[PDB]
Amino acid sequence: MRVGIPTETKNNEFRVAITPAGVAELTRRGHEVLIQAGAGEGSAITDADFKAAGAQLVGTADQVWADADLLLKVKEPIAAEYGRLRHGQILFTFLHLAASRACTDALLDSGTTSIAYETVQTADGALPLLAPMSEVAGRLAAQVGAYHLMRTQGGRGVLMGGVPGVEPADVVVIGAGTAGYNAARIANGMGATVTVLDINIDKLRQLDAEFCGRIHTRYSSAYELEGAVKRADLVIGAVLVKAPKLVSNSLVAHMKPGAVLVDIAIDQGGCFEGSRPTTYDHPTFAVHDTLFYCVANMPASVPKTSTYALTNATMPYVLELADHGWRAACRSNPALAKGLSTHEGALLSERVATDLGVPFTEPASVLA
Amino acid sequence: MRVGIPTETKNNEFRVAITPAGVAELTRRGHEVLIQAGAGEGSAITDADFKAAGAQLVGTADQVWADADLLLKVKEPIAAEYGRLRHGQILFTFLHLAASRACTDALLDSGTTSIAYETVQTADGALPLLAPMSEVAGRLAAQVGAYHLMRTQGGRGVLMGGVPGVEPADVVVIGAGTAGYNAARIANGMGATVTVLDINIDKLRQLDAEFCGRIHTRYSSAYELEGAVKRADLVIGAVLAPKLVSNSLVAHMKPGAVLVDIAIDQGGCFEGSRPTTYDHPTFAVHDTLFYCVANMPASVPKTSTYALTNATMPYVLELADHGWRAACRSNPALAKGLSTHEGALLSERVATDLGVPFTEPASVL
Amino acid sequence: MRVGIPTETKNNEFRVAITPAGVAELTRRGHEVLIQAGAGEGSAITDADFKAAGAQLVGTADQVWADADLLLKVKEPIAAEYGRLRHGQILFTFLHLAASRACTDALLDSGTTSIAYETVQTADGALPLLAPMSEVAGRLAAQVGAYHLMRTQGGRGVLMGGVPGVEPADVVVIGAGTAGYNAARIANGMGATVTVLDINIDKLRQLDAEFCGRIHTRYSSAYELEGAVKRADLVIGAVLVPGAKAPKLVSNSLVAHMKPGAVLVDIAIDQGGCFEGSRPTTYDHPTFAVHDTLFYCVANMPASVPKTSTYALTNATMPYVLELADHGWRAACRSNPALAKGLSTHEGALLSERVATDLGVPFTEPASVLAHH
Amino acid sequence: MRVGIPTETKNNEFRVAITPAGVAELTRRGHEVLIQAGAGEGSAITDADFKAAGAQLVGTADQVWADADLLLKVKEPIAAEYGRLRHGQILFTFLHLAASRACTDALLDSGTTSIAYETVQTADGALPLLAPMSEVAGRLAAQVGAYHLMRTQGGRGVLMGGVPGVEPADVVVIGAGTAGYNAARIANGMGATVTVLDINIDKLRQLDAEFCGRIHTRYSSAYELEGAVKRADLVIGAVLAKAPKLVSNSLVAHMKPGAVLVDIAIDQGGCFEGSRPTTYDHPTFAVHDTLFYCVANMPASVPKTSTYALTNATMPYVLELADHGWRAACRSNPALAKGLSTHEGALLSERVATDLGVPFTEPASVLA
Amino acid sequence: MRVGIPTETKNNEFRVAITPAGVAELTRRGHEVLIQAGAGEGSAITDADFKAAGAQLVGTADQVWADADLLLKVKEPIAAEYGRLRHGQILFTFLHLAASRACTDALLDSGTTSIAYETVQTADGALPLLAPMSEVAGRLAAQVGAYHLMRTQGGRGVLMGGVPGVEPADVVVIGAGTAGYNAARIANGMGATVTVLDINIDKLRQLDAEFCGRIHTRYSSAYELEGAVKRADLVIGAVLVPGAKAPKLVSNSLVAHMKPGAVLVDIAIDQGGCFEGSRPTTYDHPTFAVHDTLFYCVANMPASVPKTSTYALTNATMPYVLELADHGWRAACRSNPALAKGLSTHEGALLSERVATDLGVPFTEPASVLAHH
Ligand SMILES: NC(=O)c1ccc[n+]([C@@H]2O[C@H](COP(=O)([O-])OP(=O)(O)OC[C@H]3O[C@@H](n4cnc5c(N)ncnc54)[C@H](O)[C@@H]3O)[C@@H](O)[C@H]2O)c1
Ligand SMILES: NC(=O)c1ccc[n+]([C@@H]2O[C@H](COP(=O)([O-])OP(=O)(O)OC[C@H]3O[C@@H](n4cnc5c(N)ncnc54)[C@H](O)[C@@H]3O)[C@@H](O)[C@H]2O)c1
Ligand SMILES: [Mg+2]
Ligand SMILES: [Mg+2]
Ligand SMILES: [Mg+2]
CATH class of the missing domain: 3.40.50.720 (NAD(P)-binding Rossmann-like Domain)
Known part of the structure; x- marks a missing residue:
C-alpha cells in the first residue's frame, strides 16, 4: 500500500x-x-x-x-x-x-x-x-528549568550543581513515572540535590536502587509535598494519570522568590493550580514571586x-x-x-x- | 576598621x-x-x-x-x-x-x-x-549550550542526553582547564557524549582517570581538533585568547550547531566571536549559532x-x-x-x- | 532410574x-x-x-x-x-x-x-x-574480540580502551539480551565505545539505566545497523529468536564496506549465525577472512572456561x-x-x-x- | 641488630x-x-x-x-x-x-x-x-556515629541511609583532612546525606570530584558551621598544636534532640567545647539534649x-x-x-x- | 639537521x-x-x-x-x-x-x-x-592475561568476570604505577577480583579513592606478596625503579605453590623481569611453562596495537x-x-x-x- x-x-x-x-x-x-x-x-x-x-x-x-x-x-x-x-x-x-x-x-x-x-x-x-515523548519531556524539563533558574531569565539565580563549597539547586520532581524519572536523572546529572515524590513505593525503590540513594525519595503526601515544595529552587510537575492539581496557588505563595515551576503535565490540564499552556515565544509567566514554565508540546523543541x-x-x-x-x-x-x-x-x-x-x-x- | x-x-x-x-x-x-x-x-x-x-x-x-x-x-x-x-x-x-x-x-x-x-x-x-568564576562559567556553559541546542532557539534540535535508542548530543570542549573540566562534567552528567581536546596530556590523563574513560580525551592536533568540531552539535571553547576555531572551519559544521565561547572575556577563542548580551545572547555565523555573553557568572x-x-x-x-x-x-x-x-x-x-x-x-x- | x-x-x-x-x-x-x-x-x-x-x-x-x-x-x-x-x-x-x-x-x-x-x-x-551460557559467551566475546583486534592476530591494531588523548575501539553489539548485555558490559569495562542495537526498546531502556547512558543504544533498523557496522572496529552478533535460526542481519555486501582488520564475533553461530558470511568454526581454528575483516564463529564458546x-x-x-x-x-x-x-x-x-x-x-x-x- | x-x-x-x-x-x-x-x-x-x-x-x-x-x-x-x-x-x-x-x-x-x-x-x-591512624579513626567515626544514633543508645533513632520514601540521616563532617575525608566517605557509603566543612577550597574541590557532587561541600565559617550543625543528626569533629573549639555548648543547645557528636580530635583537646576524653565501656555522655562520643584512641578498637x-x-x-x-x-x-x-x-x-x-x-x- | x-x-x-x-x-x-x-x-x-x-x-x-x-x-x-x-x-x-x-x-x-x-x-x-607505553602495556596485560586463562590456551579455564553465582578470576597486580593502575583498571572492568600491591602507600590511596575500595590494595612485603600470588589465577608484574634492572619479587619456588594453569604476565620484562623465571618472549612465541604455570614475557607489548x-x-x-x-x-x-x-x-x-x-x-x-x- x-x-x-x-x-x-x-x-x-x-x-x-x-x-x-x-x-x-x-x-x-x-x-x-x-x-x-x-x-x-x-x-x-x-x-x-x-x-x-x-x-x-x-x-x-x-x-x-x-x-x-x-x-x-x-x-x-x-x-x-x-x-x-x-x-x-x-x-x-x-x-x-x-x-x-x-x-x-x-x-x-x-x-x-x-x-x-x-x-x-x-x-x-x-x-x-507516548513513552518516548514522556522521556524527552522529562529530560527537557531539567534543562529548561536549569536555564530559567538564571536571574537573567527571572529565576532565583541559582546554578543547578553549585560549585565546590556552595549549595546546589534544590530540585523537587512530583511523580516517579517515565517523565518524572527522566527529569530527576538529568537534574541529578547536573549536580542538583533532587528529591522525587510518589505514592508508588515500588517506583521510589527503583530510584533508590538505580542512583544508590543519590536521588532522594519521599512518600508523597500533601504534607510532605508542601514541605518539599517550600524548600525547592526548581519544581517539576510530572504526574501522569485529567491531571490532579497538587500545587495550589496558596502553596506557591510560600515558595522562595524566583523559584521555577516546570509543568510537564500541561498536555492534560497541568498539575499546578496556576498552570496555563504557554508557547515558545512567551514560555513563562509569574505566579506570586515564582516563575511558571508550561509550554505545550515540549518535545517539539528538540x-x-x-x-x-x-x-x-x-x-x-x-x-x-x-x-x-x-x-x-x-x-x-x-x-x-x-x-x-x-x-x-x-x-x-x-x-x-x-x-x-x-x-x-x-x-x-x-x-x- | x-x-x-x-x-x-x-x-x-x-x-x-x-x-x-x-x-x-x-x-x-x-x-x-x-x-x-x-x-x-x-x-x-x-x-x-x-x-x-x-x-x-x-x-x-x-x-x-x-x-x-x-x-x-x-x-x-x-x-x-x-x-x-x-x-x-x-x-x-x-x-x-x-x-x-x-x-x-x-x-x-x-x-x-x-x-x-x-x-x-x-x-x-x-x-x-578568578577560579570560582571559571568553575561557575564552565558549568553554565553546559546548561546554556543545551538550551540553545533547541530548535526553538535556532539550534539544531538535539537533546543533550538523547533517550534510549536515540543519539545523544555530540559535545566538544576545547581546553581542559578549570572551566573546561567543569563544562565537560556538567555536559557529561546531562547525558551528552563529551570529548575534551587539549595538548597537555597530563590533564587529559586526569580526565580519563576521573570519569573512567567516559569523557573522551583527544590530544589536540589540527586533525583531531577539526574532525571533532565538524562532528559536534555543541562546542564549548574554554581555553584561557588564541583563535582555535576559524570561520572556515565553522563553514563545515552541522547546521544549527551551537558554539559557546567561555573565553569571550579575553577576546574569545573562536575566530567569529564578538561579545554579546543577555537580551541578545546569540548570533549567526554560517549555519551555526554563537553564544558569547560576557560575565556569564553574573547570571546566577x-x-x-x-x-x-x-x-x-x-x-x-x-x-x-x-x-x-x-x-x-x-x-x-x-x-x-x-x-x-x-x-x-x-x-x-x-x-x-x-x-x-x-x-x-x-x-x- | x-x-x-x-x-x-x-x-x-x-x-x-x-x-x-x-x-x-x-x-x-x-x-x-x-x-x-x-x-x-x-x-x-x-x-x-x-x-x-x-x-x-x-x-x-x-x-x-x-x-x-x-x-x-x-x-x-x-x-x-x-x-x-x-x-x-x-x-x-x-x-x-x-x-x-x-x-x-x-x-x-x-x-x-x-x-x-x-x-x-x-x-x-x-x-x-540458555542464560548462564549466554552470560559466559557474551563475556568471552568481548575479550576474544579485543584479542583479535591486535595487529599480531591479523586485526586492525587498535587497543580496546585507547589511552588518554587517543580514541578507543568502536564496538557495535547487535542484541541487548543476555549475551549482548554481557558483551557490552565487558567491552565497556575494557574502555571501548559501545553501541547496542535491539528491536526491543525496553532492553535498550534497561541498558541506558544500568550504565547511565555510557553504553549507547540504538533502535535496530537495517538503516541504523548498516551505519553502525560500517563505523565499527568490532561487531558482536548476539540476536536470538528462541528455537529459531538466526536472521542474517549483516550482509557480505556490508562487510565489504567495513574498516580493514575489523573483527566480527558471531555469538549466534550456534543457531546458524546472524552474519551472512558466518560458518561454524573451532577453538583449534577459530577465525577466517571475509573481505578485509576477520570472522570468529565458535559455536561452543563457554567450553574454554x-x-x-x-x-x-x-x-x-x-x-x-x-x-x-x-x-x-x-x-x-x-x-x-x-x-x-x-x-x-x-x-x-x-x-x-x-x-x-x-x-x-x-x-x-x-x-x-x-x-x- | x-x-x-x-x-x-x-x-x-x-x-x-x-x-x-x-x-x-x-x-x-x-x-x-x-x-x-x-x-x-x-x-x-x-x-x-x-x-x-x-x-x-x-x-x-x-x-x-x-x-x-x-x-x-x-x-x-x-x-x-x-x-x-x-x-x-x-x-x-x-x-x-x-x-x-x-x-x-x-x-x-x-x-x-x-x-x-x-x-x-x-x-x-x-x-x-599518623596518617593511617587518622584513616582508621575517621572510618570508625562513621560506624560508631551510626550505632549511637539508635534510640536504644540514647540517640535520635535515625538510620544512616533511611529507606525508600524516608529521609536519611543528615551528617556534618567538620574538616576535610585525612580523618574527615574518611568519615565523609563511609557515612556517604552508608547512605547518609553528608556535608563537609573546610576552609581549604582545594580539599572541597577534591571531595566534589571524588564523589561527583554527592558529598556536599561548604566553605567553613562559624555562620555556615552553626547552620549545618543545627540541621545535623550526626556531627563528626575532624579538625587536625591544640584543636580549636568550633562547636560551643551554646550551639549544642540549639541542636536536634538526640543528635550525636563524635569528636575525633579528642586526642588533642577535642574540637567541641563540651568534649572530655571517654573510655570504651562509658563511651558517651549527654550535653544538653545531645550525645557526645569522645573515646580516646579509637583505632585501638580495631x-x-x-x-x-x-x-x-x-x-x-x-x-x-x-x-x-x-x-x-x-x-x-x-x-x-x-x-x-x-x-x-x-x-x-x-x-x-x-x-x-x-x-x-x-x-x-x-x-x- | x-x-x-x-x-x-x-x-x-x-x-x-x-x-x-x-x-x-x-x-x-x-x-x-x-x-x-x-x-x-x-x-x-x-x-x-x-x-x-x-x-x-x-x-x-x-x-x-x-x-x-x-x-x-x-x-x-x-x-x-x-x-x-x-x-x-x-x-x-x-x-x-x-x-x-x-x-x-x-x-x-x-x-x-x-x-x-x-x-x-x-x-x-x-x-x-614511558607513561603512554605503560598505559598501553597495562591495558594489554589484562586482555592477554584473560586470553591465556582459557583452557584452550593451556590456562586454568576461568572466566575473568565469572558469572552470577560463580566466582570470578583472582588477579594480583604488583606495582600501582602507570602500568599497574591500567592493568588493574582493565582487569576490574572485565569483572575480575583485583588486588594491587605497592610499597608506595600513596599509590594505594589513589587506587582506593578511584574505585571506592573495589580494587583491593595491599602494602607490598614479601610475606603479603607470597600469600597473594598463591591465591592468584593471574599475576601481573608491573614494578619499576626508573632506569634500573627490575627486582625479582616472584621466586620459582613461589611459582611452584601456585594454582595449576595460573598465568603470569611480566610487563617489567623490558627492564629484566620481576619474576625469577622470566625471560624475553616474542609475539610469535609469547608463553612458556614455569612449573605448572604459564609465563608471558613480551618486552614490546604495545607493538600489537x-x-x-x-x-x-x-x-x-x-x-x-x-x-x-x-x-x-x-x-x-x-x-x-x-x-x-x-x-x-x-x-x-x-x-x-x-x-x-x-x-x-x-x-x-x-x-x-x-x-x-
Ligand atoms: N556460541 C556460543 O558458545 C553460544 C553460547 C551461549 C549462547 N549463544 C547464543 O547467543 C545468542 C543470544 O542469546 P541470548 O541468551 O542473548 O538471547 P536473548 O533472547 O536474551 O536476546 C536476544 C535479543 O536479540 C534481539 N533481536 C532479535 N532479532 C533482532 C533483530 N532482527 N535486530 C536486532 N535485535 C534483535 C531480541 O530482541 C533479544 O533482545 C543465541 O543464539 C544463543 O544461543 C551462543
Ligand atoms: N613490556 C612492555 O612492552 C612495556 C611497555 C611499557 C612499559 N613497560 C614497563 O612496565 C614497568 C612499569 O612501568 P610504569 O610506568 O608502571 O612505572 P611506574 O614508576 O609508574 O610504577 C612502578 C611502580 O612499581 C612500584 N614498585 C617499585 N618497587 C616495588 C617493589 N619492590 N614492590 C612493589 N612495588 C614496587 C613503585 O612504587 C611504582 O609505583 C616498567 O619496567 C616499564 O618499562 C613495559
Ligand atoms: Mg506481518
Ligand atoms: Mg639501606
Ligand atoms: Mg627552540
Whole structure:
C-alpha cells in the first residue's frame, strides 16, 4: 500500500512522522512511501535523505493526503486539513480527541479510520508510543528549568550543581513515572540535590536502587509535598494519570522568590493550580514571586531527538498496518486496537464518547 | 576598621561582594560592616539577613564609600562612581585596568589604594579569586549550550542526553582547564557524549582517570581538533585568547550547531566571536549559532556571590585585621593584586599595556 | 532410574553435564548415576571425585548411552554419536536443531525423546538454561574480540580502551539480551565505545539505566545497523529468536564496506549465525577472512572456561534434571510448562514449531504427546 | 641488630608494633626479632604466626627491653615501664611528650634515644605515620556515629541511609583532612546525606570530584558551621598544636534532640567545647539534649586493622633504623630525623621544650 | 639537521617513531626528514603519506643511519643494527640499558650519543615518555592475561568476570604505577577480583579513592606478596625503579605453590623481569611453562596495537624531538633538565648512574658532558 507523511502544519511543530530508516523498511516490504517536500527539514532530514531511502517526494499536502492509504502524522489534523480527511484512509497520529470536539467531529463526519498514538496500550497498561515523548519531556524539563533558574531569565539565580563549597539547586520532581524519572536523572546529572515524590513505593525503590540513594525519595503526601515544595529552587510537575492539581496557588505563595515551576503535565490540564499552556515565544509567566514554565508540546523543541524517539516506537505498528490493513492489524494486536478512534462515522473510544456526550460504538463490533 | 559594601551598579550585575557569613566573621573580630540597603537583593540576600549577621544598613551609596576603610566590590567602579573614590581607602574588586584607561585614570586621580581580585596569584601560578568564576562559567556553559541546542532557539534540535535508542548530543570542549573540566562534567552528567581536546596530556590523563574513560580525551592536533568540531552539535571553547576555531572551519559544521565561547572575556577563542548580551545572547555565523555573553557568572548571582566571596574571605579578613601593607607583606599572593596607591600605578603589565609610568610594588611595601 | 553422562566429544569441549553435588543428590533420591571415565577431567572433576559422590564409572561411551534412561549432555550429539541415540531414552542437552537438518534427522530416526536446554522457557519468556551460557559467551566475546583486534592476530591494531588523548575501539553489539548485555558490559569495562542495537526498546531502556547512558543504544533498523557496522572496529552478533535460526542481519555486501582488520564475533553461530558470511568454526581454528575483516564463529564458546561454565550450567539445569529423574519426561513436562517448552523430539515426531517450519519438516503438537487419558 | 617488641600494657591497648610480614623482612635482612609471648593476640596474631615469620618469643617484658637495641611500641611507656628504659637503646613509638612531663622526664633521665611516630614528617608537611591512624579513626567515626544514633543508645533513632520514601540521616563532617575525608566517605557509603566543612577550597574541590557532587561541600565559617550543625543528626569533629573549639555548648543547645557528636580530635583537646576524653565501656555522655562520643584512641578498637595500617607505615623506617642505626638513618632521612625526641638526656623537640620549659638541644648538634 | 626514522626490526614491531604531522612540523622548521621506505606501514602510514608531509623516502636502513643527525626509533637497537650505530649521531629511542650489557657495550663502543625515552623525567618524578607505553602495556596485560586463562590456551579455564553465582578470576597486580593502575583498571572492568600491591602507600590511596575500595590494595612485603600470588589465577608484574634492572619479587619456588594453569604476565620484562623465571618472549612465541604455570614475557607489548600506540607515543615524544632537531642534544639538554635525565651514552661514557651501578660499569656524571667552556 501507499504510506503518506505530510509536513506538520501546527505552529512550531517541527517533528515528522517518519525517518529514512522507516522509509527504507516500508520500501523494502514493497510499500510505496509518499512524503511532502520539506516534511523532514525541521528534524534535519532533507528531501534527498528521504528519496535515497526510497520515498516519492510530492509538492503538495493534498497529493499526499489524496494518494495515501495510510496517513502518518505527529499531531492531530487542524482546521486547514479537515477537508483532506477521507473514507478508506487510515490516520495514525496523536489525536487527543477528548480535548477537541472539532477534531473528533471532523474525523467522524469524514468517515475516516483513525487510531491514536497515545491510547495504544500494552496489557501491562504501558503506553509505548507516548513513552518516548514522556522521556524527552522529562529530560527537557531539567534543562529548561536549569536555564530559567538564571536571574537573567527571572529565576532565583541559582546554578543547578553549585560549585565546590556552595549549595546546589534544590530540585523537587512530583511523580516517579517515565517523565518524572527522566527529569530527576538529568537534574541529578547536573549536580542538583533532587528529591522525587510518589505514592508508588515500588517506583521510589527503583530510584533508590538505580542512583544508590543519590536521588532522594519521599512518600508523597500533601504534607510532605508542601514541605518539599517550600524548600525547592526548581519544581517539576510530572504526574501522569485529567491531571490532579497538587500545587495550589496558596502553596506557591510560600515558595522562595524566583523559584521555577516546570509543568510537564500541561498536555492534560497541568498539575499546578496556576498552570496555563504557554508557547515558545512567551514560555513563562509569574505566579506570586515564582516563575511558571508550561509550554505545550515540549518535545517539539528538540525535533531531531523526538522524531527518532517517536518513530522508533511507532515503526512496528506502522509496518503491521501497512502489511495487514487496519482491521487485521488490530485483530492481531489488542494494544494497537486500544488506539482505535473512529471508523466510518463510529466513535470507537468509550472515554471520548462519554466526555463528549456522543454515542459510543464498541470496537469489537467494527472488527467484525 | 570599617568595611563597606555598596550595591553593584553595572547593568545586569546582581552579585554582591560579601555574604552574612563574611559579615559575622568581620563582626566577631570587632570590625564594623556597612552595607548599602538592597545590596544583597540580586543575590537573594535580604537586608535583614545582613543585619542579623551584624551589618549596619545605610541608605546611600555615598555614605558607604565615605565611611569605609576597606571597600569590597564585585566589578570595577564605573563613571558615576568615580567621584566616590578616595585616598586612604582600600578598594578590593575585579578591576581589569588594562581594558580601561578611564578607570585606571580615575583610580590614579583619586589617590585610592586598590587591589585587583583577578591578579591575586598564588606561588603555583593559580588565580584563586578568578577560579570560582571559571568553575561557575564552565558549568553554565553546559546548561546554556543545551538550551540553545533547541530548535526553538535556532539550534539544531538535539537533546543533550538523547533517550534510549536515540543519539545523544555530540559535545566538544576545547581546553581542559578549570572551566573546561567543569563544562565537560556538567555536559557529561546531562547525558551528552563529551570529548575534551587539549595538548597537555597530563590533564587529559586526569580526565580519563576521573570519569573512567567516559569523557573522551583527544590530544589536540589540527586533525583531531577539526574532525571533532565538524562532528559536534555543541562546542564549548574554554581555553584561557588564541583563535582555535576559524570561520572556515565553522563553514563545515552541522547546521544549527551551537558554539559557546567561555573565553569571550579575553577576546574569545573562536575566530567569529564578538561579545554579546543577555537580551541578545546569540548570533549567526554560517549555519551555526554563537553564544558569547560576557560575565556569564553574573547570571546566577546567588551561586556566584558565594563562590566569589568564599574565595575572597581569607584576604578580606587579613586586610581588615592588618591593613593593606602588613597584609601584602605577609602574603605575596595578595601583593600580586596591588594596582594603585596614592596616585601611583603598581602593575607593570597594566602600565605597559597602557603606555603609562609605573611604580614598582616593592617601592610601597 | 539410571542417569548417564558421557564425555563431551565436540572440538575442545571441556565442560561436563553434571558435578559431584548433582550426583550425590541424584544418588540420594535412589537413582543410579553412570559416568564415562574421564568425563569431568576438562572441568577438573576427577573420576575419584565422581565416584565418592555415588557414581559408577564406565569405560566406554557406548555403555553409558545403552544403560542410561536419562542421558545428560552439554552439546548436541555429533555424527559419531548418531548410532548411540536410543528409542526410550531421554536426551537433555543443548540441541540447536534449527541449525542442523542432520542432527534433527538422527534424533527423529532414532525414536529418542529429546528436550533442549535452550528452549526451556519460563512464563515471563526467560530461557533459564540458555542464560548462564549466554552470560559466559557474551563475556568471552568481548575479550576474544579485543584479542583479535591486535595487529599480531591479523586485526586492525587498535587497543580496546585507547589511552588518554587517543580514541578507543568502536564496538557495535547487535542484541541487548543476555549475551549482548554481557558483551557490552565487558567491552565497556575494557574502555571501548559501545553501541547496542535491539528491536526491543525496553532492553535498550534497561541498558541506558544500568550504565547511565555510557553504553549507547540504538533502535535496530537495517538503516541504523548498516551505519553502525560500517563505523565499527568490532561487531558482536548476539540476536536470538528462541528455537529459531538466526536472521542474517549483516550482509557480505556490508562487510565489504567495513574498516580493514575489523573483527566480527558471531555469538549466534550456534543457531546458524546472524552474519551472512558466518560458518561454524573451532577453538583449534577459530577465525577466517571475509573481505578485509576477520570472522570468529565458535559455536561452543563457554567450553574454554569450564571451571566457570560447568558450574554455571549445572547450577541452572540440576533442578530440572532432578524432576526428570524422579518422574520421567512426560510427568515432569506435565508438571512444568517451562520444561515442556524444551520438548524437541519423541518417537520420530518433531515437537518444535519454529524448528519444523525453519527446516521444512512436518510438525507435531507437544500437547498431543502430553494429553491426558 | 636486635629488634624487640613488648606487649602493649596501657588499658585497652590491643595493637602491636609489628606484624609477621615485618618480622620476616627484618629476619631476612639478618636482624633478630624478639617479641613478648602474647603480644599480637589482641590483633589476632598468635605467637605461632610470629614464630613462623622468624621471631624469637620470650616469656617476659623485662627480657625484651633488656636485649633489644631497637624497641618498637605503639603507645608511650607508662610509669611501670620507666625502669625498663635504657642508655644505648632506640625507642620508636607514639610519644606525645608535650602531654606528659612524667614520660618526657623518664626518657631524659634514662638517657634513651627516642623517636616519635607522630612527629616523623615529610617535606610536603604530611605526617605519614599518623596518617593511617587518622584513616582508621575517621572510618570508625562513621560506624560508631551510626550505632549511637539508635534510640536504644540514647540517640535520635535515625538510620544512616533511611529507606525508600524516608529521609536519611543528615551528617556534618567538620574538616576535610585525612580523618574527615574518611568519615565523609563511609557515612556517604552508608547512605547518609553528608556535608563537609573546610576552609581549604582545594580539599572541597577534591571531595566534589571524588564523589561527583554527592558529598556536599561548604566553605567553613562559624555562620555556615552553626547552620549545618543545627540541621545535623550526626556531627563528626575532624579538625587536625591544640584543636580549636568550633562547636560551643551554646550551639549544642540549639541542636536536634538526640543528635550525636563524635569528636575525633579528642586526642588533642577535642574540637567541641563540651568534649572530655571517654573510655570504651562509658563511651558517651549527654550535653544538653545531645550525645557526645569522645573515646580516646579509637583505632585501638580495631587492632587487627590498626596494627597493620600502622606497621605498614612504620616498616620502611624500622628497616632503616635496623639496617643503619639511629644516627645514620636520621642523617639520611630528614623525615625520620623530625621524629627525634630524646638522646642521652637531651630534649630534641623545640615544641616540647618550649611547652614544658626544658632546655632545647638542637637535633643537628646530636647528629654530629 | 637530518632527522632519520628507520623501520623497526624487533619481532612483530609495528610502531613507527614519527607520524606525517611530526614530519610536517620538522620540515616547516627547516629540517630534512629521512624515512626508510615502508617504516610506517605497520601503523597504516603509507610512504605516500610521509612523502606528502615532506619526508625523503630512502630505500635502505643503512642510508637512514648513515645520513641522520638525529635518529628516532621506538625500540633499542638489536644485534643486526649494532654496526649502524655512529659517533656524532643522536639516537633517541627506548633503551632499557640495565637489562642489556650487550646493547650498552654497543652504544659505548660506537661513541654515539643516546637518550632513552624511559629515563626522561620531569621534576615531579614522572616519566612522560614511558607513561603512554605503560598505559598501553597495562591495558594489554589484562586482555592477554584473560586470553591465556582459557583452557584452550593451556590456562586454568576461568572466566575473568565469572558469572552470577560463580566466582570470578583472582588477579594480583604488583606495582600501582602507570602500568599497574591500567592493568588493574582493565582487569576490574572485565569483572575480575583485583588486588594491587605497592610499597608506595600513596599509590594505594589513589587506587582506593578511584574505585571506592573495589580494587583491593595491599602494602607490598614479601610475606603479603607470597600469600597473594598463591591465591592468584593471574599475576601481573608491573614494578619499576626508573632506569634500573627490575627486582625479582616472584621466586620459582613461589611459582611452584601456585594454582595449576595460573598465568603470569611480566610487563617489567623490558627492564629484566620481576619474576625469577622470566625471560624475553616474542609475539610469535609469547608463553612458556614455569612449573605448572604459564609465563608471558613480551618486552614490546604495545607493538600489537600500533594504531593506538604509535600516536600515543609520538604525542609525547614529539615536543622533545623538535627541541633536539632545532638545537642539538647539548643545548636542548642544557635548557631542559627532564630531557637531560634521559642522557645515556656519549663518546664512550655511560651517563646513567643506575645503569652503571646495575651493569658494574664506570659512571660519568652527565653535568661533565653538559659543562660550559
Ligand atoms: N556460541 C556460543 O558458545 C553460544 C553460547 C551461549 C549462547 N549463544 C547464543 O547467543 C545468542 C543470544 O542469546 P541470548 O541468551 O542473548 O538471547 P536473548 O533472547 O536474551 O536476546 C536476544 C535479543 O536479540 C534481539 N533481536 C532479535 N532479532 C533482532 C533483530 N532482527 N535486530 C536486532 N535485535 C534483535 C531480541 O530482541 C533479544 O533482545 C543465541 O543464539 C544463543 O544461543 C551462543
Ligand atoms: N613490556 C612492555 O612492552 C612495556 C611497555 C611499557 C612499559 N613497560 C614497563 O612496565 C614497568 C612499569 O612501568 P610504569 O610506568 O608502571 O612505572 P611506574 O614508576 O609508574 O610504577 C612502578 C611502580 O612499581 C612500584 N614498585 C617499585 N618497587 C616495588 C617493589 N619492590 N614492590 C612493589 N612495588 C614496587 C613503585 O612504587 C611504582 O609505583 C616498567 O619496567 C616499564 O618499562 C613495559
Ligand atoms: Mg506481518
Ligand atoms: Mg639501606
Ligand atoms: Mg627552540
